[PDB]
Amino acid sequence: FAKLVRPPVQIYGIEGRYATALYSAASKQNKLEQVEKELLRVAQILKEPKVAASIMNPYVKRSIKVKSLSDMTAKEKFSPLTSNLINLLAENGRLSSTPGVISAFSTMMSVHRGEVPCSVTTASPLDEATLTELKTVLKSFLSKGQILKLEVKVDPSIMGGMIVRIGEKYVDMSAKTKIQKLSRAMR
Amino acid sequence: TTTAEVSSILEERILGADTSVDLEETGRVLSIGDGIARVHGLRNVQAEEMVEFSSGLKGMSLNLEPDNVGVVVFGNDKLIKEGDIVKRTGAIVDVPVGEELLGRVVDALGNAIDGKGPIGSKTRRRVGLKAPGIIPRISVREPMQTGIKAVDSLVPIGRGQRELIIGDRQTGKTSIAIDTIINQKRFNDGTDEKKKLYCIYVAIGQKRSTVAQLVKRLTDADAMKYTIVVSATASDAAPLQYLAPYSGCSMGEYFRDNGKHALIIYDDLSKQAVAYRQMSLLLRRPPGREAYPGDVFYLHSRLLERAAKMNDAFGGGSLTALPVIETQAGDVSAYIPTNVISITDGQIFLETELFYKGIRPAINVGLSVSRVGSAAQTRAMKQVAGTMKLELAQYREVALDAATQQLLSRGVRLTELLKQGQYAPMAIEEQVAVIYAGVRGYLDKLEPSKITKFENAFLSHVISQHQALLGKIRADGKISEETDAKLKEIVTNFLAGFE
Amino acid sequence: VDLEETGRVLSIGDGIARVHGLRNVQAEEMVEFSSGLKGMSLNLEPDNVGVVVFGNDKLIKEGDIVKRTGAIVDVPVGEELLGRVVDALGNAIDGKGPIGSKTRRRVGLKAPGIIPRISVREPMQTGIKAVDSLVPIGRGQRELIIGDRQTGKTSIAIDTIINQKRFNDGTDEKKKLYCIYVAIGQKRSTVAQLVKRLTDADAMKYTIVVSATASDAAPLQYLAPYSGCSMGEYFRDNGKHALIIYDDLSKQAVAYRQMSLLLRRPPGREAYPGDVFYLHSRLLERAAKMNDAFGGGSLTALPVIETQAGDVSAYIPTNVISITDGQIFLETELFYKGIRPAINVGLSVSRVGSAAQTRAMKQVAGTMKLELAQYREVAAFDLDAATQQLLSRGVRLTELLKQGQYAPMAIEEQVAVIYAGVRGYLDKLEPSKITKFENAFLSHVISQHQALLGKIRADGKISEETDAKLKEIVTNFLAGFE
Amino acid sequence: ATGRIVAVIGAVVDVQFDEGLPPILNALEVQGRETRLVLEVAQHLGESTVRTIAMDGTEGLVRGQKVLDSGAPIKIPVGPETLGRIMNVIGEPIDERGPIKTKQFAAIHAEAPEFMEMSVEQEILVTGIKVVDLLAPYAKGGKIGLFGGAGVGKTVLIMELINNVAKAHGGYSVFAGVGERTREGNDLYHEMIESGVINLKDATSKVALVYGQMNEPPGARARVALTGLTVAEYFRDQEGQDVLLFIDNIFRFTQAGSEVSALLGRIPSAVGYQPTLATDMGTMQERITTTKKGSITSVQAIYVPADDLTDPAPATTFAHLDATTVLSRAIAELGIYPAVDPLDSTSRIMDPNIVGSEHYDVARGVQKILQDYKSLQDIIAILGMDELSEEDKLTVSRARKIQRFLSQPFQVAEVFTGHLGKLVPLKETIKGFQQILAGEYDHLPEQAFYMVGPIEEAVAKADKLA
Numbered sequence A: 001f002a003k004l005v006r007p008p009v010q011i012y013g014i015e016g017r018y019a020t021a022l023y024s025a026a027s028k029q030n031k032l033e034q035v036e037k038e039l040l041r042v043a044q045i046l047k048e049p050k051v052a053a054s055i056m057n058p059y060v061k062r063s064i065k066v067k068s069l070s071d072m073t074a075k076e077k078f079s080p081l082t083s084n085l086i087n088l089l090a091e092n093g094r095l096s097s098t099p100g101v102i103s104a105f106s107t108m109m110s111v112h113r114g115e116v117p118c119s120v121t122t123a124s125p126l127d128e129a130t131l132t133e134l135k136t137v138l139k140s141f142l143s144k145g146q147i148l149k150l151e152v153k154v155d156p157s158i159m160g161g162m163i164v165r166i167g168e169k170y171v172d173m174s175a176k177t178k179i180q181k182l183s184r185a186m187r
Numbered sequence B: 001t002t003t004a005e006v007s008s009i010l011e012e013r014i015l016g017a018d019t020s021v022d023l024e025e026t027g028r029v030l031s032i033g034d035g036i037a038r039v040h041g042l043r044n045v046q047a048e049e050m051v052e053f054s055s056g057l058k059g060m061s062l063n064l065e066p067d068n069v070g071v072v073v074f075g076n077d078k079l080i081k082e083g084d085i086v087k088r089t090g091a092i093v094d095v096p097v098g099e100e101l102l103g104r105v106v107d108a109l110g111n112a113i114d115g116k117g118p119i120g121s122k123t124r125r126r127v128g129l130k131a132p133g134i135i136p137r138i139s140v141r142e143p144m145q146t147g148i149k150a151v152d153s154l155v156p157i158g159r160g161q162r163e164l165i166i167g168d169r170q171t172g173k174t175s176i177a178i179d180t181i182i183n184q185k186r187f188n189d190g191t192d193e194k195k196k197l198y199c200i201y202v203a204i205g206q207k208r209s210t211v212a213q214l215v216k217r218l219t220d221a222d223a224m225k226y227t228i229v230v231s232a233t234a235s236d237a238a239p240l241q242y243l244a245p246y247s248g249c250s251m252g253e254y255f256r257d258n259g260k261h262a263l264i265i266y267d268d269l270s271k272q273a274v275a276y277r278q279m280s281l282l283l284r285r286p287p288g289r290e291a292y293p294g295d296v297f298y299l300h301s302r303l304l305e306r307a308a309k310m311n312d313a314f315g316g317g318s319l320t321a322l323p324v325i326e327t328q329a330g331d332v333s334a335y336i337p338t339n340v341i342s343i344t345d346g347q348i349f350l351e352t353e354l355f356y357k358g359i360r361p362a363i364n365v366g367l368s369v370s371r372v373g374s375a376a377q378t379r380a381m382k383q384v385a386g387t388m389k390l391e392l393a394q395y396r397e398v399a400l401d402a403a404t405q406q407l408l409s410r411g412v413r414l415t416e417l418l419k420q421g422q423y424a425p426m427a428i429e430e431q432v433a434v435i436y437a438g439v440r441g442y443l444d445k446l447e448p449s450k451i452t453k454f455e456n457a458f459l460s461h462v463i464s465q466h467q468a469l470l471g472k473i474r475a476d477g478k479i480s481e482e483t484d485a486k487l488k489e490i491v492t493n494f495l496a497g498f499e
Numbered sequence C: 001v002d003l004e005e006t007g008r009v010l011s012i013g014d015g016i017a018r019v020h021g022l023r024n025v026q027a028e029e030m031v032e033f034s035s036g037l038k039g040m041s042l043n044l045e046p047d048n049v050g051v052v053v054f055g056n057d058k059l060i061k062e063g064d065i066v067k068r069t070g071a072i073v074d075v076p077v078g079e080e081l082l083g084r085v086v087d088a089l090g091n092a093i094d095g096k097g098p099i100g101s102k103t104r105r106r107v108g109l110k111a112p113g114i115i116p117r118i119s120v121r122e123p124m125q126t127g128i129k130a131v132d133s134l135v136p137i138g139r140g141q142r143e144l145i146i147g148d149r150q151t152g153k154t155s156i157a158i159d160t161i162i163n164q165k166r167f168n169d170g171t172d173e174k175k176k177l178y179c180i181y182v183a184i185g186q187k188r189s190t191v192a193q194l195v196k197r198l199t200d201a202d203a204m205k206y207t208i209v210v211s212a213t214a215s216d217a218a219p220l221q222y223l224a225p226y227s228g229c230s231m232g233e234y235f236r237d238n239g240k241h242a243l244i245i246y247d248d249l250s251k252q253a254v255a256y257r258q259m260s261l262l263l264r265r266p267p268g269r270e271a272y273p274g275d276v277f278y279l280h281s282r283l284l285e286r287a288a289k290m291n292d293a294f295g296g297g298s299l300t301a302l303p304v305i306e307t308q309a310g311d312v313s314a315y316i317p318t319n320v321i322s323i324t325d326g327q328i329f330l331e332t333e334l335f336y337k338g339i340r341p342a343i344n345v346g347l348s349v350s351r352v353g354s355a356a357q358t359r360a361m362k363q364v365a366g367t368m369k370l371e372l373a374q375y376r377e378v379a380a381f382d383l384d385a386a387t388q389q390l391l392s393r394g395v396r397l398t399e400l401l402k403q404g405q406y407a408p409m410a411i412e413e414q415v416a417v418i419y420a421g422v423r424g425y426l427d428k429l430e431p432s433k434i435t436k437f438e439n440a441f442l443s444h445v446i447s448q449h450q451a452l453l454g455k456i457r458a459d460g461k462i463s464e465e466t467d468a469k470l471k472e473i474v475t476n477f478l479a480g481f482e
Numbered sequence D: 001a002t003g004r005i006v007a008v009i010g011a012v013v014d015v016q017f018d019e020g021l022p023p024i025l026n027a028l029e030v031q032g033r034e035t036r037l038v039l040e041v042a043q044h045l046g047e048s049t050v051r052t053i054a055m056d057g058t059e060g061l062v063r064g065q066k067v068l069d070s071g072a073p074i075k076i077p078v079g080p081e082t083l084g085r086i087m088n089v090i091g092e093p094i095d096e097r098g099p100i101k102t103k104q105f106a107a108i109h110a111e112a113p114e115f116m117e118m119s120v121e122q123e124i125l126v127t128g129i130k131v132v133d134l135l136a137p138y139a140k141g142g143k144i145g146l147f148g149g150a151g152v153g154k155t156v157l158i159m160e161l162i163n164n165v166a167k168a169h170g171g172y173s174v175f176a177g178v179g180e181r182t183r184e185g186n187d188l189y190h191e192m193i194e195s196g197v198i199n200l201k202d203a204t205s206k207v208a209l210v211y212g213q214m215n216e217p218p219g220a221r222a223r224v225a226l227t228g229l230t231v232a233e234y235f236r237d238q239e240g241q242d243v244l245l246f247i248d249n250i251f252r253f254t255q256a257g258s259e260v261s262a263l264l265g266r267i268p269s270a271v272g273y274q275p276t277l278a279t280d281m282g283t284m285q286e287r288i289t290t291t292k293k294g295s296i297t298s299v300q301a302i303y304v305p306a307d308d309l310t311d312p313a314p315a316t317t318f319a320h321l322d323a324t325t326v327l328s329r330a331i332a333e334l335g336i337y338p339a340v341d342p343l344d345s346t347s348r349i350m351d352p353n354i355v356g357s358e359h360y361d362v363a364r365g366v367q368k369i370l371q372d373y374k375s376l377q378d379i380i381a382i383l384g385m386d387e388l389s390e391e392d393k394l395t396v397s398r399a400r401k402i403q404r405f406l407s408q409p410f411q412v413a414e415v416f417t418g419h420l421g422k423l424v425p426l427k428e429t430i431k432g433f434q435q436i437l438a439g440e441y442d443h444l445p446e447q448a449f450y451m452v453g454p455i456e457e458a459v460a461k462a463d464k465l466a
């Protein structure tokens, strides 16, 4: 077995194996972007009333499903290796997990291009000046030739402080500060 | 997930490079471990077909899963790695067979391990052939002389019979088999061509040194030239120990199917059962009694049932089997012993109590039986052995009145008579004469401790000058009235001379 | 195609049919297959339904349409089932025509609570001297007939069935006991012989034989006790008294184990499911004695447990013993020693005890129990007045306890016999002739002194005049016989 | 409809059909094999895939091999032409005498007779054996079981029962050898040829033979009993005859089921047995019954693994038998042949109304004295015989004499011990045991009752050792 290119995230699960294999195959021949686009457009052609049905139906032969998908992917301009991936999923019966495979590969490619969102959850959003200030400070945290995404949340339970998860760090200056008052309560 | 749902196979599929590799006839190991190797490919492989690995080891395709093939490795699994290429041999697992293996010490797969060169076999026979049916078989007729007085007298073994040698550790189970191997030399040297018995010895799990010493004993007695030693020792992998009995069984089936008579010694079938239990448990199969698999009885039955006597329509050959079962603390009522007893046509119990007391061989004549043994017994030996068995049974029943005192004395004399040395099997007529001496009450006068000396002298006396009487007994097969009178006269004369 | 009120079989194997669909099927709901076979949805898995098949599965194949019935599995119930031999689902199998039952009842109904129950008062006469004397069974009680194979459990059950005939054909409605027999795992030949015995004794007219034989599928054998339990509950809630015999619950446990293991549910102790105790507890707890506010009915239960080599400490026997109120230990050693029925009175107990027992029987049974206890204390191995006399009296009482098969005795006749034994009228006779004396005395009393037996039965206790008259007649018969 | 082999694991073969899934219990012929490998469908695994149990060895099976559906369960030749012929699991004559030309075929799998078809008639089948006739008498048309360990006397006892009943039986007989020694089958075939019960010349043979032996794969051993049972069913139903069905050994059916259930994918039950241990056994056994059309007097030998009667396979089969004969190794150690345990063998016709008052009384007295002796055995074992009471000594002596007198030589065992077989009638053994219990023979030695038939032989043996 030839060695395969490991994706950066290295997700696990049934979709994990397929996503890792696809990432390794597309890294070879340098077709990551084309495969990613074909995956993001193949999910939409996997949610039609006719297409979504007859693949979750367990009483139709896999051969029928394989062909129904081979001709569909052929007429959908797909003639690289993504057609092979769809055919393999149809043959192995993991068709229901195909959206999960697409999501996993999308996350892998996102980590290849973007970064883990810096989730901030304090309260209702403040002024846009503070938003861009925190975006700039998060960029300074990253500062590795990369650009991070942002996800702002609202939490009434969290008091005047904020909690920020810059990647996998998750600093905490929030209602837990008032929890740390137990030290005075203890001794 | 599944075994073939691995990322490497998926990459091979999606990349489209699934065309260069020959998945029809070759395969790559997905996962080697626990003695079972999963192989991806071999789409044209057969069930039980033997496949050879890249390293050189050979394996049997046991499980044909939809996506992979479960191959049991006949060797150490260290030499097998993931990614190794497995290729078909296009044949169900077989073993070299023929007379070219006579005198060769081979392993489970037939490979020579005595360093005497390659086996010059011309035909290979499958190790898992079905046993012959009802029609091809005929009742056991010809005797199979073991040379042991107790065996050939009270528990006669026919040619084509299956007699179990069951006992505890260090009870002479192997010694009986070795003496049986040596005893056949007299028949093999001659030109009878119908009394020749080509022996086979299979070692399952026992020490390599023990097997080497057994081979040395056979060579020194000039008995290797007509025997085959199949060795699967403790160091050998469990599949080798599992397969070893079937290899020897096929080697004996070759003689059986060509009008010849063969003997197979499945030494330590209990160790084969242990090895198969290991194989099954490493395969994660539901264990049963004593953690054994549910098909151990089938494992031994499909092996021992192959030993049979063929009728004249199928050449008239035969294959006698003498399996050995090791019992813990003399537990006859145990899973494997009871399974084997339900298969064999008899048993020879070797009590450790008798062995400790000096009664060698330690045959428990009360519990040792031979179902089809009476038909395959010579007339003179039958004539003496019937009376011997009756007297011994009566002795066992009673063990101050004059009658019971005489019965006990005669029983003691017969018991001392049954004692025999090692590596010295006796001719049938010599045993007949010896048992005749004891049965006809020519030993009641002697002290019990002098009986062995009396026999040692009487054998020498008869075998030296009275060779004509022994030859007449051997040719006739019965003790005639004139023969009876002459034997009575000579035994009385020697008794008077012995003093 | 609809996937909410119907579905298709994904996979059928060993009587288990995985169904795709049935999005509106309920737990334990009876479903119906294409071939006419009925099922029961036990496993409501997220993407499939595990249905146990009530019959042979050779007629069920992948793709067959499975349809709901909309109701939890229920059994035809009523008094029309009297005299009928039915199966687990209530279908008639004796070829007498259809059952005319107008009502149906769920097989898994909850047991009565604390409030509806009342104390066990009325006795449940079995016709067995040992049971009716030393291990009395009340009405509404649940007694376990435990023992090994071929010890007499089914004999005790059938003798209890036959004994009720005198009450059932009588006048008063408060003594009628409508028996029910459940055959689990027995072969059809044994059930046919049992129903022939019942018909010979004319006990069929008031009994219901629910048979789930060995050939029947495991779900039927698992459901059979609950069907008979519902049939008894019908009588219980309508002011009538019923008797239910589960013969035997061990085979029902085996069937439930097979069902659970085939449903991929994890095994437990001895491969049995975790809720084997629940399986019997939710069944035997439905044997209750309702008070007057609920009609005053009752349902006496007689479960039967088979023990391997007398291992009473096994899983299922211990569960059933803990559930029940009393145990009737049958021992093979006592069986072969001539003590038949082999009721080990040393270990046989009844939690209700003297609470539900006629007065005369209790009065004489106290003395008999004390004497037998002393005898057992001095049984195994030289005061003629203290030990030898006690030993002889115990031997006489033991020979008294012995009774023939299929010959239940009236309660008053049992009282008379035990009175004769207790008051030293058999110490003179040989132990061997005790049975002959008992038969002859039974004949004489049932022939000439029927007035005395009627007085005993009506009064319910033996008074001074009755005691004197019984002493007179027993002395006269002892003089005549010997 | 033709399918392709997908999985070959042991004797379990999985086949995927493009269309037309064969129902369960349907025979499938595997194309491309020199022999006739026929698969029996056991499960519908979904995805148009079935799981089958092979009736022969699965060696050489290639994934994707074409297998054709027969469209019907395994059918065997059945009829009068099957008498005097040897058949395998799938009804192929293995006696090399040509095809079995029967006018009809019967499916292996059938439904057991219904409740109404059952018969309740009970008689006594006097077999000429003291222990069987006295304590656990056999009933005509009732299931009979011969329990025992390994080498305790099951085969010898069933051969003696054949020699006693079948030769004198007016009706036909069927022998189904399930998982036993093949040489035993050959010996039985030659014995029946010599005795004339099987004739190779004219159609006067009375016994039909079905043989699936221990050399057969587990799939074959789990269905040969069904083949013999089907032949017996035809002879019982479609001809209204009285038939004897000898099965040896019937435990191998359960053992084969256990072997195949591990591969079939079932969670094992106790002692690694299949969860469907009682269901399949009941399905097989309830077909061996006496209906109103005819009677099947069946004698079944039941192997007891490790001499453990509490093992599930020999434990669940007790409920399927009218008369039970439990051999014991401990008795066989004492030389008492047959090794029947008098305190463990039971019969359903042992009732004073059926067997008679005198017979029941004698049997119960013998059982009582034997149980008393067994209870006393512990004190005798530890302290000694001299510590017992005089009455206890008398009971011990009488019980030991009864134990000796239960032993009986067999005609089939003559070639073994050299003692001529004895066939006592019921009245003679009743009288002998009644006399022994009474005490008329309290002066004879214990050995006077060993390996003798009628009590006259015991008294004529006692004076020999005067």
Ligand SMILES: Nc1ncnc2c1ncn2[C@@H]1O[C@H](COP(=O)(O)OP(=O)(O)OP(=O)(O)O)[C@@H](O)[C@H]1O
Residues within 6 Å of the ligand: B167, B168, B169, B170, B171, B172, B173, B174, B175, B176, B206, B326, B360, B361, B420, B421, B422
């Ligand atoms: N007939 C005999 N007379 C004297 N000694 C004997 C005899 N047979 C065997 N022995 C002794 O028994 C010992 C080993 O016996 P043997 O190897 O045959 O027994 P075993 O039970 O088969 O052994 P194991 O279980 O170790 O393979 C040796 O010391 C040998 O000398």
Ligand SMILES: Nc1ncnc2c1ncn2[C@@H]1O[C@H](COP(=O)(O)OP(=O)(O)OP(=O)(O)O)[C@@H](O)[C@H]1O
Residues within 6 Å of the ligand: C147, C148, C149, C150, C151, C152, C153, C154, C155, C156, C340, C341, C403, C404, C405, D319, D347, D348, D349, D350, D351
């Ligand atoms: N009271 C009794 N007196 C005499 N014999 C009896 C008595 N009770 C039972 N038997 C005998 O016991 C045998 C049948 O017992 P029964 O069927 O009641 O026992 P069991 O434990 O329920 O059996 P099984 O496990 O076979 O269902 C017959 O031989 C019958 O004669």
Ligand SMILES: Nc1ncnc2c1ncn2[C@@H]1O[C@H](COP(=O)(O)OP(=O)(O)O)[C@@H](O)[C@H]1O
Residues within 6 Å of the ligand: B341, B342, B369, B370, B371, D148, D149, D150, D151, D152, D153, D154, D155, D156, D157, D337, D338, D408, D409, D410, D413, D416, D417
């Ligand atoms: N009635 C009998 N008399 C003497 N020996 C017997 C008798 N029955 C069995 N045996 C002994 O048992 C052996 C055969 O047992 P068998 O019937 O094959 O038991 P199993 O069928 O359980 O293996 C014979 O070798 C014989 O010595």
Ligand SMILES: [Mg+2]
Residues within 6 Å of the ligand: C153, C154, C155
């Ligand atoms: Mg019963």
Ligand SMILES: [Mg+2]
Residues within 6 Å of the ligand: D154, D155, D180
């Ligand atoms: Mg046998």
